[PDB]
Amino acid sequence: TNIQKRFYKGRVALNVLANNIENAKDIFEAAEGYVVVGVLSKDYPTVEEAVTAMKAYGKEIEDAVSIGLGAGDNRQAAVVAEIAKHYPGSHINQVFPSVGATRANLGGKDSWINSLVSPTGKVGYVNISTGPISAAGEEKAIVPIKTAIALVRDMGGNSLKYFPMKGLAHEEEYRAVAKACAEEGFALEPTGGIDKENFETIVRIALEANVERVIPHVYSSIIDKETGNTKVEDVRELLAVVKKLVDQYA
Ligand SMILES: [Cl-]
Ligand SMILES: [Cl-]
């Protein structure tokens, strides 16, 4: 699988955004290849323009592209499902009820698809009502983490995208998600409010739980607003943290 070479020592792959193809190349070099680089569907008016762009970013970085919704924006879920017919990338961000469509649309090309599920205020339970119609309903479907993992697997997904975390604001809920993932042999992608000061703790929680594959997403906290570029020195600093941390689980 293409994404497997993106995990440092098989444990942690960074997910950060690229502003342009030069930024993607510089990020990929700074992360020593242990990264998938987000290109957002929202940034393009059509599926065709998105596909063209993503292939052009991919050409340079061994197709280590993460196909984005745009901060988990559920209106982009149908657009991402459609992009999947024409470009698999290495990694695809998707909302829970569109995972199945996206896997089918890949038409057998290898890729890794996450499933957006959200905190609920209830330790042990995730909100799977993350598509456009489901997110707009009066009640949400709030279910035990492991039942959500089982359903994601039935839809052809590889991981839980846990969002929005607001950093460590929901630490106890995140701890239980990490535990459930580890026990089910399933991958986890913490997202939302991750910065250079809470990055190590968030990843460590997952590793300590014994989650095998973790993909932390680090977005605007490492983006230089002057250029819109993800900062290369920040990506270097994050990889150094990843190595120091993972080298302890031998
Ligand atoms: Cl996304
Ligand atoms: Cl957040």
TrEMBL record:
It comes from Bacillus cereus (strain ATCC 10987 / NRS 248). Pfam families: KDGP_aldolase. The lineage of its organism: Bacteria, Bacillati, Bacillota, Bacilli, Bacillales. Transmembrane segments: none annotated. It comes from the Bacteria. InterPro entries: Aldolase_TIM, DgaF. Signal peptide: none annotated. This is 2-dehydro-3-deoxyphosphooctonate aldolase.
